[PDB]
Every structure is written in C-alpha cells, then in structure tokens.
Amino acid sequence: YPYVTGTSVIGIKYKDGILIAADMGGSYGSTLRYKSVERLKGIGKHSLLGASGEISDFQELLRYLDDLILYDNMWDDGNSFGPKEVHNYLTRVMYNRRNKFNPLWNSLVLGGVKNGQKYLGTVNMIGVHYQDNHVATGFGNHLAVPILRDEWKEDLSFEDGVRLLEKCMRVLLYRDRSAVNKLQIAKITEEGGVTISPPYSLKTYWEFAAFKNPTAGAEGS
Amino acid sequence: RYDRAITVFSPDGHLFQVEYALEAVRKGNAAVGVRGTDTVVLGVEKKSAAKLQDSRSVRKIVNLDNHIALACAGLKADARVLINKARIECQSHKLTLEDPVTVEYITRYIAGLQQKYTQSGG
Amino acid sequence: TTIVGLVYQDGVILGADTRATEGPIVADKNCEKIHYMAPNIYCCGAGTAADTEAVTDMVSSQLKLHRYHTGRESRVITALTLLKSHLFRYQGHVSAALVLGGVDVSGPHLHTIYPHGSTDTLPFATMGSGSLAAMSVFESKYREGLTRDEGVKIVCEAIASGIFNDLGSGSNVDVCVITKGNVEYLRNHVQPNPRTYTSAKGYTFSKPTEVLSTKVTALA
Amino acid sequence: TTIIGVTYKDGVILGADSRTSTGVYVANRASDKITQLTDNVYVCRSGSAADSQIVSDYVRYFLHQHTIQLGQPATVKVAANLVRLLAYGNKDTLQTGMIVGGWDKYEGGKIYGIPLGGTIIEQPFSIGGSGSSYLYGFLDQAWKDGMSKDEAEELVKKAVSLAIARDGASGGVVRTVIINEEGVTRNFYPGDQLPLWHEELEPQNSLLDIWG
Amino acid sequence: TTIIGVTYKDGVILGADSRTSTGVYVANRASDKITQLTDNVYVCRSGSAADSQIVSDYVRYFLHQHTIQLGQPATVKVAANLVRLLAYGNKDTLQTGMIVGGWDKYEGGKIYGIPLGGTIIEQPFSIGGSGSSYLYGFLDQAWKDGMSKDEAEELVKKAVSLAIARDGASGGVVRTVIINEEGVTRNFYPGDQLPLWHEELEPQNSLLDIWG
Amino acid sequence: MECVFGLVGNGFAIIAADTSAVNSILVHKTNEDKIMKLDSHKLMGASGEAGDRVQFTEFVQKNVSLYQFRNGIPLTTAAAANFTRGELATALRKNPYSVNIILAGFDQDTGPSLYFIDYIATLHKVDKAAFGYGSYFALAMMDRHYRSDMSVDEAIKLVDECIAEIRTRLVVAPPNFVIKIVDKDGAREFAWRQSI
Amino acid sequence: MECVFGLVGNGFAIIAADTSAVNSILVHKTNEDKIMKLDSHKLMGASGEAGDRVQFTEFVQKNVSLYQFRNGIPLTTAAAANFTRGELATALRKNPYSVNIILAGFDQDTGPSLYFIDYIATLHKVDKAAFGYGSYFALAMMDRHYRSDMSVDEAIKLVDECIAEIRTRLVVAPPNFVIKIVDKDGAREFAWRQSI
Amino acid sequence: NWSPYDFNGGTCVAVAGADYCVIAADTRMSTGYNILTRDYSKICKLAEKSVLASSGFQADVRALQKHLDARHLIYQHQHNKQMSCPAMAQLLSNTLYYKRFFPYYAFNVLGGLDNEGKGCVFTYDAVGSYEKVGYSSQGSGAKLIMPFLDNQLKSPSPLLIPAQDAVTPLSESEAIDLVRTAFASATERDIYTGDKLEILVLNKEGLRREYMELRLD
Amino acid sequence: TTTLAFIFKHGVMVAADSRASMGGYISSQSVKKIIEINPYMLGTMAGGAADCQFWHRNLGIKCRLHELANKRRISVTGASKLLANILYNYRGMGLSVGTMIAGWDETGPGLYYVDSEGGRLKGMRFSVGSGSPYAYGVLDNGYKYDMTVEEASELARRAIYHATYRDGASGGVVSVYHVGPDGWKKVTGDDVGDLHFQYYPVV
Amino acid sequence: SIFEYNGSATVAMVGKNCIAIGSDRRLGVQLQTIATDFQRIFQIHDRLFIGLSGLGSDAQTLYQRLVFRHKLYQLREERDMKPETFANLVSAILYEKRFGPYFCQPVIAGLGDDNKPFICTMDSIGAKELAKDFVVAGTASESLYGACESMYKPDMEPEELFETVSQALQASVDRDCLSGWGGHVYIVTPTEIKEHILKGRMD
C-alpha cells in the first residue's frame, strides 16, 4: 500500500531547455507529515527528474540511478547517457518490477537536454510511458494538462515558462487537498546544467464576494 | 559431484577406456544368440552346476519385457544396472505410447545409454 | 459530460457540451443538456440521465403549480429546496446531479446539487466528467464583474477545455444566458470540430439484398 | 474538515475551515460550514454534507415553530437538544458531527458538542471534524476559561489554521462566528491573514521575483 | 505509542511513552521504547513490538561490525541508513515506525524519521506512533530552533504528556534520552511529575480525604 | 458418479462397474471398460476422475509388472493393495489423485480376496464393497443375501440384482455394466451386461 | 430433472414428457404423469421445481375451469396460453414460479397449436418445443425429420426416436416417457413408453 | 490495491491485397477518460516486409514490440537472413502464448508481403491464436469498423471445396480510401480513437507513411 | 463450436464448423478447426483455440521426431496417448483443449477423443463442442457402419449444419474430411448460409 | 447479464419523409434458437412503430400494457397518439419501475404531424435518446452503430432507405452470435407501409 505519498509533478519543455515543478509535500493518508521533502533531483550531466507517489520508492530509484550514472561516468570514454537512455532505463525497471507484482509505486517525470536535442517524458508505476512537450503526473494530469495544452508554445521563454508552470501549480494548489504551498521549479539547460529553485510559496486569492457571503443577507451568511 | 574426463582420446585416437571395456567383455561368460524362422534361441555358459551354486534365484538370460529377452557378457554387476534401466524404460514406453517397444527401439535405447556413459564426466 | 455555471455581473451563465455516450460509444452526437425549469431558472444535468430529467421535470411541474398558486414569479431558492427535499429522501439512489441557475427578485443565483441532497452556492461551478478540465479554466480566468461577452467567452473556453481534454464529453457547445428579464439560449453556439472526411464516391450495396415477403398497406 | 467552538465570558465564537472534498478533489473551497438556527444560535456542520445540511434545515424549522409558539428567543440548550433529537433518532443514516453555540439571557454563552452518534456534551469548548485530532494537544495546553471576544477570536483562528496547515481534509479560509448579547458577527480570514507555522514560507507572486 | 525526537543546540532529546496494549489491556505499563544502537545513536521504537526490536537488534549487530572494522564511532547517518535498509527491504513484512537520533562529531546532533515504508527524512524534530496526531498542532505552534538542553527536554516532556493525556494507546511514564557530546543520559518522569492539562485534577490518596 | 462394487465368493472374487463415459451431461461412450487386469490374477476397478483413474491405475500396473519382471514372482494381492495405498497416501498431500480403488485378486495359497481403497487411502480386506452413488443399493443388497461361501452362479445372480436396482432406482442409472471375475484360472471378463 | 417436448402435426399436437419423480438420487416414482389436461382440448406439459410445477398448473386449471362454466364457451388455446403467460410474468417479480410450460390445444376454427412459455414468461407459438437437457436431442432430431403435415404415425415415430436418443445420450436419461395427443376429438393420452 | 493492466485504447486496421498491405491505426492513448498523449504511434515495422500494429495496454504492447525486435535480430544473426512475414507471424503467436498464464494485453495485427509478394494480414488475440485474413481490425473501435469493412470487402470463405471465385481486389488507392473512411466513421462514434490517423502502406517499392487528421475530442 | 467424427466401412469422417465466437461477438468465420497433424492423421480443434493450436503444433513436432527416430510413422494410438500425457502434465493449469485424433494406422482406422484433463477415450463416433448435443442428435439417427462415402459425408454435413442452426456459437463453412487408407482428403466445404436454403427450399 | 439472455438487434433510420425500422427474428434461452420468427417490432398505429429489444418477456409485457393505454387514449381523445407523446408515455411507464426496471431497450419510430419522421430509443429506465439520423438497440449495439454510421445518408428515398437499413442490419447481425436467423424491416411512408422479411444467415 502507499504510506508516505507525494503528488503532481508537471513538466514543460521550453526554449533552450526544460522546466519541471513539484511541491515539497509528502502526505501520509490525509495528514501532511512532511513539508520539506525535495522531490526533484538532478541525474547525470544531461538529465533531471521528479517523482510522485511513494517517497520510499523514489529514494530507491535515486540509488539505482546514482549507481547507473556513476558507473557511466567512471568509464571516461567520452560518451554518456542523455535523457533518452535514462528514461528508457527507468521504463524498463518500472515495467520489470511490475512483472514481479512488486511495483515501484512512483510516477516519474524525466527530462533533459543533450547535444541540443531536448527530451521530456514520463513513466507510470506500471511501465506506461510517453515522451511529450509537456507532461504531468497525478492530478497534474487532470487540472494542469488542460491549461498546459491550451497555453504551451513552441518557443516559450524562460519567464513565460515559469509563469505558465506556476499557473498550473497554483491551479493545483487551489483544488488538490494533497498539495502544500511549498514548491520548487527546476531548470535544466544546455551548458548551464540543472538548477533547482529555492523553495517558496505562491500568493493565493480568496476575497471574492460570493465566497465571503455564500447566498447574500444581513443576517444569514 | 565428481566431474573428470575418465574417457579421453589417446595420442593414436583410441578411447583406451572403451578398449579396456571390450577387454573386460572378452573375459565374461560366453553367450550366443541365433535367430530362426519362428523362434530366437539364446544361450550362455554357467560356471559349474556341481559347484555349490544356487542358480534358482538368478537367471543368466533375463526379460526386459514379456517380449524382449537379454543376455550380457562382461561385468555382471553392471549388467544389473542396464537391465533395471531398460526394464523401467520399456514400461515407460508402454506408458507414454500405448504400444510396447520394438526390439530395435530398446536396442537403440540401451546402446545410447551405454554410449552416453562413455562420454559424460566422472 | 461537462456542464458549467458562471455568475457574471448581470446574471448567471450556464454551459454544456452536447455529447451523450453509453459506455465507450457515443449514442447521441447532439444532446440537449441545459434544461428549462422556469422562465428565470435553467439547470444543466449531470449524472444518471433518467434521474436528472425525472427530477428536473418533477421540480419544474411543482414550481409551475406554485407559480399559479402564488401568482408571483418563482425564485431559485424554491427550486433548490424542492430538489433537496426530493433527492435526499431517496438517499442518493436517484443519482441526479445538477448545476442550477437563475435570476430572481434577489438577483443571480448559482447552485450545485448532488445526488444526496448536498448543495452549494458558488460563483463558478462545474460538473460531469470534464469538471476538472473546466475548473482549470475557471480557477485561471474567473474574476468578479465579468461582462456578458467576457463571461460567455470564459464559459465557452471552459467547455472547449472539457471537450478536447476529456473523452466522456465532446461534440458541440450550448449556452443559456440568464439576465434579469430575458434568457438568451443558444442551441449550438460553438461547433469547433467538423467532420474531417467527405467519403468521396458513396459505397455501393453490391448484394441485392434478397427479400422473402412484402406486405404493403395503402395507408389513407 | 475542522470545526471548533470556544466559550468566552460573554458568549460563543463557533469556527470552520471551508473545504468540501469528494475524494482528493476539492469540490468547494468556500463552503459555509456554520449555519443559522435562530438569530442567536448557530451550528458548526461537519461530516456528511447532505445529512448535516438537512439536520440543520429541520432544526431550523422546528425551532421557528418553537420560538413562535413561545414568542420568545429560543435557548441554546433547546437548540442542542433538537439537534440531538435527529442525530440520535437517525443514528443509522446520519453520519454527522456538530457543535452548537449560542447565547441566552437565561444561561449566557454555551457550547454543546453533538459528536457522531448523537450525544450532547456541554463543554467549555469543542473540536470536531477530521482536523480535530491535530488540536487536542494544542488546545489542552491553551484553553483558559473566561476570555474576551478578542483572545477567543485569536485562539479560534490559531486552532483552525494549525489544523488547516497539517490536515489534507481541512483548508481554505477560516470562518468564525461571534455570538454575543449584541448579536452574531461573522468573519472571514483568508490564508493570507493567518500566521505561518513550522516550515512555511511567506507567499510570493512568482519565483521570477526571487529566481532559481 | 508516542515517540518524539527534538534537536537542540548540542545534541538530540528522544522521548516516548510506556504502554504496550493487546486490545484494551495494558500488557506492560513501563515499556522502554528507546533502544540503543550505539554509544552515539538511540532509536525510538514504534509499531509492532516484534519488528521494531528485531530491526533494532540487527542494526545493533551491523553497527558493532561496522564500527570495529572502521575503528571510529558510527555516525548517525550510517545508523539511520542501516535502519532504513531493514525497514525498506522488508517493506512488505515489517510494520514499524522508527526515529533515529544521536550526536556524532561530524554533523552534530541529528534526527532521522523513518515512518512506515522506510523514508529517511532528516528533520529538526520528528514524531511517531498513534500519539503524534495530538502533537502536530502543538509542535507547529511550539517548535523553536536551537533550544538549550533544558528547553528541549521540557518541550519533549510537555509533548509526550500531552499525547498521554488524550491518547488511549499512550500512557505511563515519560522516558527521555539526551544524547550529547559528553554522553547519553536517560531520564524517567512518572505520571506524577508531569504537568496537568485541561480536565485533570490533582491526584488524591482517597475520597475520605475530600468527601469524608 | 462412476459406480463400481465388488464381492468375494467361494473361491473367486467379482468386480462390477458401469461402463459409461460421461462429460458434464453427455454420454460420449457407453462401452468404457473401467476394470483393468492389473495382473494375471488381480483386478483393479476404480472410480474417480477419468484422467486420474487412467493415469493412476496405469502407474500401478507399471509398478506391478516391473516387480514381476524384477523378482520373477508376482506381487501378492495384499502387497499390491498395500503398495497402491502407499502410493496414493504419498500423493495425498502433494498432488492428490481423486480415484477410489477396489482391488480383487486370487492368491494361490490364501484364496479369493477383495480389498477396498478410498480417495483418502483406507484399505480393508472386505467380503463386499461399493463406490459411487450406487454403493447404497449395492451394499444393502449384498448384506441382505450374501454368504461367505456363495458360489459363482449365485454370486452373479446377486450382482445382477444389484445392477438392476442401481439401474432402476438411481437418478443417473448407468445403462451398461461389466462383470469381471478372478479365481484359480486368472482374472477374466464375465459376460458384459448390455442394456442398449 | 424434467424433459418435455412437443410437436405439431397436420391435425394434432403431441406432447411427451419423462415420468420420473426424484428427490436427489432416488427415483421415488417413475409413473409421475406431468402432462396435464386443462380442458377436453388442451394439454399443458410443465417442467420445473415439482412443487411449483404442481401448484402453478393447478392454479391455471382452476382459472380455465372458472372461465368455462361462467361464460359457457371454453378458453381458446391462444387465450389460455396468454393468460398463463400473464400470471407467470406477474409472479416473476414478486414470488417467481420456476416452471417451464408447453401448452398444446385444438380449436375447431384454428386447428392444432403448440405454445412455448418459459419460466421467464416469454410466450411464443412454436412449431416444435422442448425443455430440459433432453431439449437438445429432441430439437435436433425434430428439425432433422420434422415436416408440417405429419401423420400421427409419423409424429409418434419421431417422438419414439427422440425418446430413444434422450435415453441413449443423456446421463440423467429418464427411463419412462408419456405421450399425449390433442386432436379434433380432444386432449388424450396416446401411449405410455415403458422402458423398465 | 493495484491492477496489473490498463485499457489504453486506440484502434488498428489492416487490408492486404494483390501486391501491397495497408496496416493503419490511430494515434491516441487514454487512461480512463483523459488523453495521455496525442502522438502515440501504434505501428511498428519489424522487418523489411512486416508491420505490427497493436492496441491495448501500452506497456505490454511496447514490451512485445521490443521483444520481437530482439528475437528478429537474433534470427538475422544466426541465419544471415531476414525473417519472412509468415515466420514472424508464427513467432509472434508463440511469443504471445508462452505468457499464456500472464498474457500480454495486446491485440495485434500483422501485415506485409509474403516472400513471393502477395500481401498478408494475421489477426491475433491476447492468448496467441492467429489466422491469416485479407483484412482485420482490433482495438476499441474494431467492432465499429468491421461491419463496414465486411460489407464492402466480402468474398467466399477459402474453405468452400469447389472454390467459388473472389471479388476483384481493391487496388491500393481504394484500400487507402476505405481505411480512411473506416477510421473517420469509427472516430465519429468511438471515444478512444482519434487525434490523428497513421496510415502505413507496404508495397514492392517500400513502405510509405501518411496521415489523416481525425477530430480531437 | 461443434465438431464430430465417426469410423465407418470406408474410413473415418471428420466434420467441423468454422465459427470463432468470444463473448457474444463473432471474431471470425474462417477459422480452420481441423488441424492436419500428419498426411494420415487429423486433429480437430475444440475448446480453447490458442491451446488447441499450440498443443497440436507440439504434437505434430513430437510425431515428426518420432518418424525420424524410429524410421516409421507413429500410430493414432501413440499420438493420442502422447497428447493425453502432455495435457495431463498441465491438469490444474486451466487448459481448454478437447480434440478428436482421427487417422488410419497400419491396423485400420482409429479415432480417439482427448481432453484438457487427460481424459482419453477410444470410440467409434464422437462429437465435441457447445453444439455436441445436436451433432449426436442427428449423427446417431443416420449412422450405419456400412454407409458409403458419399452418404457418410452427407451425414456429417447434416449433423454439423443442425448443430450450427440450433447453436449460437456454431456456424460458418462446414468443413468435412475423409481419412482412408491413402491418407486424408478434404471432400467438401459448404457455407451454412447456402446449405440451409439447400436443405429447406423456399418454394 | 440479463439483457443478452435472449439477444436482439433493432435499428431505426430516417429517410426523406419516410421512416424505416428493422429488427432481428429469433427467440433463444441463451444460445438455443427456440424460434426463428420472433417479433420485436410492433405496430401501435399507422405511422408509429415500437421495437422492444432486450428481454423477451419484459418486451411482451410492455407491448400488451402499451396497447391497453393507447386504445384507451383513442377512446378518450379520438386521436391516434403522436410519436413524441408516445415516447414520453413509454419513458414514464419505464421510469415508474426505476428500481424494478423492465430489461427492455425500446426503439420508437413513426411518422406524424405534417408527415415528419420521429425516432428515439431509451435507457431501460426511460432516458430517451431522441435522434435524427438513426437509432440502434439490442445486443448488436456496437456493430449496428458502426454499420449505420458508415452507411447512413442525410435524406434518403424509401427504396434507398430500405436497402441501407437492410444492409446495415444484416452486416451488423452477421457479426453477432445471439442474433440473426432472418430479419423484419418496415418502410413507413405517409401513404404506404411496406413490411419486409429478409433472407438471412440461419447459423
């Protein structure tokens, strides 16, 4: 069963690089046990992934990928895994562990840029995978892919990318009940490398007259 | 598990272990079989009836099945192992295919087992 | 299905797509999902159809009888309370769920009603399968005091989002504008996805279709 | 959900959280979980939405009838007992937990907690809803009897915000309702007005305002 | 069960209750839930009493091998990761929460929560067991960074007694361990020494003392 | 369903068993001989699943014939029955066979001997037995007119009566039965009882 | 379990049925006649739970007789079938009877008719009918040899063939069948097919 | 508790002919009622004259496609020859069956030219049975496509002993058009099909890819 | 499905339908339900199609290896027993194979019915599938040992057609095979849609 | 389930000023084919026909009950009931048993007013599906939807409409094992009613 689980991890391929956002919450049933669980990591030189779902399993996937990437690096023969190979390895491991009826309970968003070809893709807890311009997991797949599809552009700027991604993440924060206001945006680019935003919280709006007074009256509401 | 090439080629290409097996055969009780128009008479030379030997319990000519009878020459102890394997496989052939074995099938099976023993290790 | 409700400055706007399905197959490409209850009240039905039409029709009749009895124009709170009193007593077995809107002596009203009788009063509402796809648009673009044209634009955007992003609902967009006096209903306001193919030469029925008997009646 | 009721010298300050969820989705962000029974008595609805709503309606109906019959402001005790009349009468069907608060010339400001199953417990304060559990420890060391309308208001805000910050089922704006001799005063505190507890940051429009 | 660990300016102060229950019978009322793993590291045992102690035994064994082979006292990080090894590799067999705390000359006093499933979360303070729900709010409201020994110990006492007071599964004494550069120290606080919270009366040898 | 029953008479033993071969509701074959000559002087009538029956009885016949070849002297009936029980018991907790066995055989010295073995291996030298739903009628009849020295013709008359009662009073009365006898001269088939 | 089937000749409608009454494995009776006479010109074979079969058939006969005496003109076959279907369908949702019914009859102005009424209360005027496991064999054989103008000799030959097959191929093959014919003269018993 | 499978939708179609074969399938993946991606290609070219189109569970479909590429590469290496279409068909039947007790949730349709050059189509089921046909369809929209394909492309079954002739084969362009109309009328009435049509036409001059824009809802 | 076979004077006939139905839907009606294991032997598909096909390929391979090893063509009894054992090793696995093995040994014809759970019968007439009841209903009436080949084939066709008519899951072309001393030959395949109106003329 | 206990296929389709309603023709316990001449289409009055797919018994009950109500309407009002009104009546009397529903999936088709076609099918509890191109019900639902979607045209003379509904029904029923054994198609025009019985596959 999933015990300590996280939530949506949206993804948006923008000009000159890739952006991924994910709140810092790990919930335990209904409680938010944890509110500072960095759920985005940088993998190798050319990659970056976030995970949703069980946080123990995600921490294990990090060990798998760290051994993979260290073994890859120690060769020093001048070729390394780009986003594509890393994502394919992730799909293979997730599917294999599904075949054992012992799944890794996570949903993985992995993306990155290598040789000027920027890749972004996803993997499910049962091996379902696809590579796209913008991906999401969990409720980010209901409440964020509509707005991502609606507003994504071929050459989205970095600031426009951040503002779109925050639009999505705020829309989730309004209506997910599993999401904490803390969150991180991760930037990966060619020749800059991965760069993870410091944690922060988004301003939210509640002062609508209909909210203040459901119905309307001097006494009732 | 003890694996070693007991049977190996000598410089001249001979299998000295198989040649020595033949030597052992050539010292065993002589046997003869003759095939007739409607009968197949086997025979063998036992070692002295006057000598205090009770032969009631073991027959030098044996049945691998109600339709197959076998005579050996050489190591008497090994003959028993062949006979048991052949009997078991004869009934097994009855049990997987309804037919009983032909003579040639069981001959081929016995020979194949005997050869396998000449190439496996240990 | 995707149904929607928005309260703009002058009144309440309702919206809904027009696909009706029975499992993975669309039974009816153009369904009428916004219903009339009273001259100032309409409701978009989601959930079990039979139940939604049954309950909305029963409340419509009750509301008309009350309109005669009192003479004065029916108000939305009456429809809401009658729907509550009916839905609850059947303990959610009648699985009708509606977005209800109107304009009254007290001004625009917008409620969501769920099969157990739980109701809400909201500035923007969405229901049906594409409720999340619509609420994306509402939580991104809604604001107070939208004018009629902006409000209708937002509702059409929400329904288009709930058409293109959810399989349960599709086809064409319909809208009902409920201002103080007049209710501007649009049978098929937005048809965003036409038929992609022409079929060129119509295909021929080679087998002559043998028939055994033909009774014929000279209908008057 | 969260619902808290606090008694101070003059009367009551019933509270709520505003989040009706249907699973993991937040069907409503500004639900009003405090309803009127009479001009001086309110109930904090919690649990099943339909059941609590209709029990509120029926109590308001019976209590209209009663207050006309007597021609006199109905008391809190009677409101609570009417809520129990239906909460206990329908143990099978109504999965509701409520807190009733009000004010009377007869007894002052009283809080009656009608937990799930239909008991009445007069209390100095009550806590309810799934977000209650995050508060027992805090309240036990916080409650001081005989506060003003102010300190009680701050305590109710703290309680509901602490439950909000940590509970999945509770969030949104904090609503409070101050009931007193002069009458009910309803308030509204968005998240922005509530304090910032352990490991929470100050809300900011866009990361573009900090960079990363 | 209630288990808590809090970091202070020079170490950690892990603390737990003492009640093992087989239904509605307190089988042991002075249980010791803070099991040593090394001179540095103690771990507060939660969940099933078999899994928690068997994991504790295995990580004691591993720390004994590792410290000797290395020749240096085992860090806290190593101990937390050894506990996680067991609790995660046996994700499907073990039902035990844990809290690893200690002091080590490298990273100073630290605390690693290891809830069900084996997620090492480094924290300033952690809480587990059934009696954590009642402390979530109190500790969001009360946590401070860098307290001294006395302040941290008193917070641990307040938190655990607040859990004891409202939690059926938590009760008895409050045990605390103060791991610090100069060494471990184990304290024991009967229910008598603990404060009194809402709705608690001074104990009394008999009623003939009051009534008569 | 497969009905088989046995009997021990003067110097012989008699096993009778229906010869229908039925799928769920369909009679694929009404000529299925379910009593095998386990040996020149033994019979093994079985009743269970068709696959289990055939495979297990063939396995026991394999072992019996192997013993006969290996030692020269065939297994005595008691030894054959005990071997069958042992094998069925060892298979009981690993991969159960669902066959019930009635083993009859004539042992030159002891005399006739019927033995009863059940799905859970329970052996008992018995002078009358029966498996299937027809066991009720078989056992009642036999207990009624059976004699420890009851000869061939009269024992077979009794078996005809048992067959007729089974065929007239069971809902699933099987039409055809086979009567097999075993005495000094070896196991044999005694006349088939056609009904259709 | 019961088997029933019908057949419409040029001026007659035969109905046959097995006559075995059972409990679990015992044929308490093999003379149980199940084809009822509703009128001088009606037959009603029924199959289903014996208690329900008897109670429903008696109820329907009561209503047929009540109609006859009160008006002076007997219910026509189609009306009797429709009334049966109505009563069975109304009971379906309230206290269902588990009876399957085949109704035959002759009316001077219409000729022989045979109605199919299922326990679900589906009514159809069938040329040939059958209920129970014997239904497969009966229907296949009738289809193979049925004509629309069969002399009672041919119809009875066909019913005999169907009975023989049902006995040969079913496992629950009942031994005794009754054959009843309806013609201009009236509902009647044609012959009893003793097997035992 | 988790489910080890998911209906990811889509639909596939194949129409063999005199010297060609039209494997065409849609481009859509759905988990319940939301679209995952609108660019999931279902056609996989396994050999120079074979094309596997699969619908169902995407993970299983892709695992199967990768496994068949591996087996075909091993075949090439061992025998120094590219594995003919019927050989591929039986290999895919075997590979589906070997997982008999934990089946792939993939409903497959091969296509392509047999070694002499006549187009083929092999229709499978999740357990592994298969049969050469002249046309086929599998996926969410198969039951809607097949009635129409049957009525326009129908001929005596090859089991009639005095063989009774067959309709003149629709030439390639007629086949493309028939597939297009089939998918248009299937995406009109089925919810799991649409967002694009991927037509793959395999012929003596090599395979060509074409597309047709189906509606987006 | 509905399939049948029966030995008579001039050999063994085998007749089968051509209808694969899953749930309530007709997957196809070109499915060949009579598998030729050997130029002198036919195996009939019934029950699970995947199971029957796979295990009949296995049986054909075992028979071919047997022909190679023994320099003599395996008999019908041998093949039937091989299949029965092979299936028995998977008794609890939920296989759905049940198939007639029909062939002409060196010792006259043979017909065995093998089953998914090791049930093997040597018989003189068989019929298997959901339409077996009607197949027997018709087959047993017209069957006579000495009926010549033409009327034997006609009897097999009529039986399969009647199973087809009264059965939901049986239909399509009616394939009929003849196994004799010189191996087997297909005699007829007649679409039931036309066979019906051959049998009951409209007029 | 219970809807495919008998199995049926019914279609309705709209021509220029004519309406056509088709149906299958077989009764079955489940797969037994008791009768190849079942009636699922009932004429209630000239220019109004109802097809009642689903359970056969529920169908007969609803038909007889509907005749009762319709005749009593003719005696009380003196006008034959208009199509849409009849659809509303059927919806009401189906929904009355909301919790005891009839397992029927009625199809309603009939000309009326200024000779204007009307077609609609309903859920088992009366949810109407007023359509304008065509309507399909029964076990062959999906196949009928595909066949009609691929074979329909907007405005069709009576003869084109007959040929199209016939081909759609037959091609869609051949892909269903619980339906077939002929067909029964009506072409209703404001001056003529033609009732056709089609030659089908009897398998």
Numbering used by the authors:
A (entry chain g): 19 to 239
B (entry chain E): 3 to 124
C (entry chain p): 40 to 259
D (entry chain o), E (entry chain a): 14 to 225
F (entry chain d), G (entry chain r): 1 to 196
H (entry chain f): 7 to 223
I (entry chain e): 56 to 258
J (entry chain q): 2 to 204
Pull text from the paper.
Arguably, the most important component of the UPS is the 26S proteasome, which makes the final decision on protein fate and catalyzes protein degradation. The two inner rings are made up of seven different β subunits (termed PBA–PBG) (Fu et al., 1999) with three different protease active sites (PBA/β1, PBB/β2, PBE/β5) hidden within the inner chamber.
We determined the first plant 26S proteasome structure from Spinacia oleracea by single-particle electron cryogenic microscopy at an overall resolution of 3.3 Å. We found an almost identical overall architecture of the spinach proteasome compared with the known structures from mammals and yeast. By contrast, we found a significant difference in the functionally relevant β1 subunit. Unlike previously solved proteasome structures, the C terminus of the β1 subunit has a 20 amino acid long tail that forms a new contact to the surface of β7. In higher plants, we even found a highly conserved tail, which may indicate a motif for an additional binding partner or act as a signal for modification. A small yet significant subset of particles (7%) showed a 20S particle compressed by 12 Å that has less density on the non-RP-occupied gate. This flexibility of the free α-ring is reflected even in our high-resolution structure, where this α-ring is less resolved than the other parts of the structure.
